[PDB]
Every structure is written in C-alpha cells, then in structure tokens.
Amino acid sequence: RLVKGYLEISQDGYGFLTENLHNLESRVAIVSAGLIKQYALRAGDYVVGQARPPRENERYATLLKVEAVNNLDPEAAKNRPRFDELTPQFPDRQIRLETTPDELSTRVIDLLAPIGRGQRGLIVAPPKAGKTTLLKKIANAVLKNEPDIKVIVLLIDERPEEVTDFRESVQGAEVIASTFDEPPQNHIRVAEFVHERAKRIVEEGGHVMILLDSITRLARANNLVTPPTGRTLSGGLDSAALYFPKRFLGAARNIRGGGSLTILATALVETGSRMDDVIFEEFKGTGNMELHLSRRLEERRIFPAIDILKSGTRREELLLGEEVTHKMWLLRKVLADMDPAEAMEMLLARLARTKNNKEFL
Amino acid sequence: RLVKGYLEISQDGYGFLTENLHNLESRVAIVSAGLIKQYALRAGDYVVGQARPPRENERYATLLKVEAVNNLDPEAAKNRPRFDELTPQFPDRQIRLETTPDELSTRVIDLLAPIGRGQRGLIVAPPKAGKTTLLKKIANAVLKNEPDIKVIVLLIDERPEEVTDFRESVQGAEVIASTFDEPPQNHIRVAEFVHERAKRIVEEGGHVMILLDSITRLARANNLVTPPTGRTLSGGLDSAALYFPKRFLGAARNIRGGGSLTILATALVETGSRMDDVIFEEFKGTGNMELHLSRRLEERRIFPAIDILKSGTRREELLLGEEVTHKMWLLRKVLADMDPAEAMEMLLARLARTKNNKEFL
Ligand SMILES: Nc1ncnc2c1ncn2[C@@H]1O[C@H](COP(=O)(O)OP(=O)(O)O)[C@@H](O)[C@H]1O
Ligand SMILES: Nc1ncnc2c1ncn2[C@@H]1O[C@H](COP(=O)(O)OP(=O)(O)O)[C@@H](O)[C@H]1O
Ligand code: BEF
Ligand code: BEF
Ligand SMILES: [Mg+2]
Ligand SMILES: [Mg+2]
C-alpha cells in the first residue's frame, strides 16, 4: 500500500507529510525512519509507502511497511546521483518557442528573452506593471508546447481573486498559491516545500519549470520573517537574509545528464524604498536571464512593455545560432536609434506579417 | 425585548455590545456564551438577542435568553458558509453607474474609475487636494443609485466640522466618525468595529460599501500606534501594523455566491515624508484599483484632478464588455497624447454633450 506525500524529516529521523492543499492541513501523516533508512533516499522526495492507522496510545497514523518508492523500485532509489552534485551546464536543450494563444506578444517574449530548459530567469517590473497575467500567459503556452514537462506555478503574497482565476484558467496544472491573507510564515513554509519538491523531482533527470509570482514580494516577506541576520543593508535590508531566496533561485540550472530546473519569477523595483532596489540588484547577479519591464512602456500600454535595451540574456549563442546572433546584433545596432515605443510598434507591425522563423526566412 | 448589535466575544465566552454612536459608551451590554454556542454564529454576525432585567450583586447587565438573531431563524444560522472561505472572484455583478447630483464630475469618476459590487478600491491625493467632499459625492450618488445596498461611511482622524457636515448631508445613511480629538486607541477601536461589522454583514450574501475618509491619515495613526517594526522601515513604519489595514482593505472582494464588500478609502502621497510614499506603495499592491490625483491638476482646480495616465483599474473587461473594452482601448491610445489639463477640459467639452452611454451610442 502507498500513502503519498512530501517528506519533511524531523530531527529524530521521523517526518511528516502534507496533503494536496499544499498547506499544513489536519490531514498530515507521520513517517518512520526505519523504512527511509532501508531505502536511504534524499530529503524532500515524493515519498510513498505503506502505513497503518493510529494505534491505541497513538494519536496519528504510523508507517508499517513500504512497497514502492517514488513510483519506482525502492532498490533502484538506493543509488542515484545527488542533485547538488549534478554537473551544471548552460541551457543546451532549448525549448523551441512557438505558442498560438498570442503569437505576437509571445513572439516578443521569444525574441527578447529566450526560455530554455534549466533557465534561471527573472522578470523585474514596478508595481501594477504587467506581471501576473504575463506569467499566466507563459504558463498557458508552456502547457501546450511541452506536455511532457511537469509545470508548477507558485503564488506568494498575492490577491485571492488572481489565485482563483489561475486555478480555473490553468487547466489542471499544479497551481499553488498563498494569498497575502496568510501570515508570512505560511509563505515561507509553502515556498520551501515546493523548493524541495522540485529539487528532488528534477534529481530524477526530469524537466521542471516553476513560475513564481511575487519573488520580491517574497523577499519583503522574508524581511518580515528575517529575524535578525545582523547588519542592516541600505534600505532596511538584511545582509545574508537573502541567502535563502538566493539559493532558491540558484537552483535553476541545466544538467548535462538530462532534466533541468527553470524558474521564472516576478520581481519588484522602483517602489520608492531602497529595500526593493537592493533586493533586485542582489538577485540580478544570480539569475541567468533578466527581463526589465520599463514603466513608461506600460504607461503607454504596449504589451509586453519590455525595456529592450536594459533587458537581455546570458549565453544566447548557446540558445541562438550565429545567424540569429548576427541578426539580433544588427537589431541592437539599429534599434539603438529607434525609441522603445516606436521600436515596439514597428516590430509589432513587422512580425504580424510572419512568424519569428518565417521573418528570419 | 431585542438588543441589536455586534457581539464582541471576550475570553470567557461572555461578550459586549455597543450603541448607535459607534463609539464606546455607557450603554454597552454584556452577553453570554451559551446561546452563541447554541446558534453557532460568527464574530460580529449581526446579533439580535434577548436578555432580562439584570439581577442584584451584578455590576453590569447580564444576558438571560435569545429569541431571534440575525433577523432570521437562529437555527438556520447553525449551518452557513464562512466569510473567509467564500470563493472570491473579480467583480462581475457590476453596479451600472449613472449619477444625477453632479453628472459631469461623476461622469469623470465613472469613466475613469469603474465601481462594482466588491470593488477593493483606493484613491490617493496629497493633503488638501479634493478628497473629503469627493467621498461625500460618491456616498450621495450611491444612496440614490442602489437603495438596496447598505452604505456605511467611516471617518478617521478628521476635523469635526466635516463630521457634522456629513451627518447632516448623508440623509440618514450610517455616518460614523472619530475626530482627531480622540486618542489613536479610539481610532483603532472604531476602525476594527466597522471592519467586523461590515465583514459579517457581507457574510450573509449582502452587498456592503465602506467609504473610508483618511486612509493614509489612518496609516499615520497606525504609525503612532506602530509598536516596533523591529527594524524601522524607510520613514518609520511597522511591518506588523500594516498587516491590519492590509487585511482591512483586502476584505473588499467579490463573492461568486452573492454579496460583496467594496471599500473606497482616501490615501495621501507626496507629503514630504517617506512614510506616506511607502504606505501608498504598500496599499497599491493590495487594492484592485487605485486612483491617483495629481497635485498640479488640483492646483488648476480641475475636479476631479485625476492623473489619468497614472490612474487605472484592474480587469475592466470583467466590468466592461467587448464593445466598451475596445472603446476604452481606443480612448487610451488617443488620450495619452492629450495633456492632463487640456485633456480634461476637452473631455468636459465633449462628454458634457451627452451621457456616457449616449456618448458611446
Ligand atoms: N499582459 C498584460 N496586460 C495587461 N495587464 C497585465 C498583463 N500582465 C499583468 N497585468 C496586470 O498587472 C498587474 C500587476 O501584476 P502583479 O505581479 O500581481 O503585481 P504585484 O505583484 O506588483 O502586486 C496584475 O494585477 C495584472 O492585472
Ligand atoms: N471637489 C472638491 N473641491 C474643492 N475642495 C474639496 C473637494 N473635495 C474635497 N475638498 C476639500 O479638501 C479638504 C481635505 O480634507 P481631508 O482630506 O478630509 O483632510 P485629511 O487629508 O487630513 O484627511 C476638505 O476639507 C475639503 O474641503
Ligand atoms: F501591484 Be504589484 F506590485 F505589481
Ligand atoms: F483634499 Be485632500 F486633503 F488632499
Ligand atoms: Mg497583479
Ligand atoms: Mg480631501
């Protein structure tokens, strides 16, 4: 028999499991140490095993046996590469980008910031400047382009109506949310839970993509959670308290042996408080691709309102041929003189004629 | 004998009720736990209850019995959905906007800031820039457009003369005020009282609108109440005090099963202290529509002096049909070019000709 959950190991070798609500609910389950030792798995796995109801003198269910682990033979689970020891590479198994629901705006997305397997991406915009629905569109496209990829969406510190909008509009993909109604400890719990789950899932050589609403909101939430860390960075920020979100985003990587972990998250800047500017800068050095969204292009209601000059990716050539290298080099040389708004509208007119590759052809 | 009020449950199951002034008075009455347990009501769910002539040896009145509660059968109260569990949606039961008392400025308001049942709205303006009587006009219009809606007005940290002006000019709708003469404790008491009152009134599937004068003044009141923040935010804010106005404003929501809660509150920016800019940004991400008011437009005495480009709402299409969707799309494409003062003067000249719908026709 297999009850299933996300293992959270307690100090004493036994652990706990949560339910499908992806929040601590009364349906938690307890996990014994002996079986995990028997199969010697790594923390945060999608654990399954046989269990027995709460015994007399026992207030909660307890583990009796295990039959199959992580949907695989437990013996095979005994030997596997460790996630943190996987040889990282640059994204070399690119996800070819072609999505129907909006071929033009999605053309802008593809042509300005490519997305590949294991991309450590980050999108940075001021408040109320085009984030959540953009993430929604990206998720919807991915759920059609690569049905094999396990796509997970995480929402921290956001409005409930957006949560329900996604849950209805995601068409069955794992949508996890934690509205601002919950105390920040709930945010941290859910975030780290999904972090470990994704890590252990990717460790199996799989391709995982996490779309994180409100990452700089999550950073402010850490600051609230941030108990001291010591010295105050400029703007009320903590020095090392960004270490946990730093590792969270740094998980995004390409692995040369198969599988990948790509995180795209929404960051806030120009909020009038140095805290957010410093947070964004601290993340900018850790992500491998950044998407600046210019507040003025949004004020002009040009979507996507991307600050093309400031925006850019790292190692396009590994995702883009020398031919695309040269054509985009020419585009940079030329559009440097074209204004962002006029450039955007010009590109809109041109690409409405043909697909990205058809435009290249 | 029926006493009607808002049960404030104390620690020991016995609670308190207040009087019509919505301020602590000598007329507060005590309540017993047993009947509340019998009818399984929720905090602040409009309580109608019986009692007796208190006995001797009791320093305060004590409750005997209950006859009818929530103006409904108390037994049915035993099983009902809870407010915090209601499935929130975007406002989809729109309140069609047609306001006679001044149809021009209110034309500007309706055509720039849609109002629907459950609108979590926010309006921002520097000091002395057109707030209080604007809220007054909104309240007066609502008291003619939807007589079925229970309209409540809350005034925090404001001048008494405005309080009397409203109480005379509201024509019987619930006007609650707490002048700055009172210490901040009174502000907090009244604010949370109204919070619970509105929440549990909406819990009955009803439509409630709260018009909150002085929301940023209320934020500064919290700052005076800001007990620590731990680390001091830019300007002197609290991390945990802002949680309470955050939840207060986030109460505003649209419910898919009927009823809604709409809060429109007045906010302050450009006050020369980082506190207010930080607070405005903090609320901006929590409200579902924010209305900037430009100080320069007010200096020109343009009412409403709205910074049209900066101002905007979320999910207009959910309130605005495809036809209106495209119409406002064209209007945003065009009016971006018109300068605020001349833009609004032109808008007055044009829309003064016809009603909004007639202008569309
Ligand atoms: N492509 C788009 N076009 C128009 N509006 C958008 C688009 N993408 C997102 N938005 C809007 O931008 C708003 C800001 O996104 P969000 O990340 O929720 O803000 P924050 O996280 O700063 O509170 C969203 O509420 C959404 O309605
Ligand atoms: N449409 C308007 N035209 C002219 N004056 C207005 C208008 N609306 C509000 N006011 C004025 O703006 C003042 C602002 O007071 P208020 O905003 O309540 O103080 P505070 O900002 O301290 O809460 C009011 O006293 C009112 O006289
Ligand atoms: F309103 Be969010 F900060 F984009
Ligand atoms: F009229 Be408000 F105080 F700006
Ligand atoms: Mg949003
Ligand atoms: Mg005013």
Numbering used by the authors:
A (entry chain A), B (entry chain B): 60 to 420
From the paper:
Transcription termination is an essential step in transcription by RNA polymerase (RNAP) and crucial for gene regulation. For many bacterial genes, transcription termination is mediated by the adenosine triphosphate–dependent RNA translocase/helicase Rho, which causes RNA/DNA dissociation from the RNAP elongation complex (EC).
Cryo-EM maps of Rho, apo RNAP, EC, and type 1 and type 2 complexes are shown. The Rho hexamer can adopt both open- and closed-ring conformations. The purified EC was mixed with Rho in the presence of ADP·BeF3 and cross-linked with BS3 to stabilize the complex before the preparation of cryo-grids.
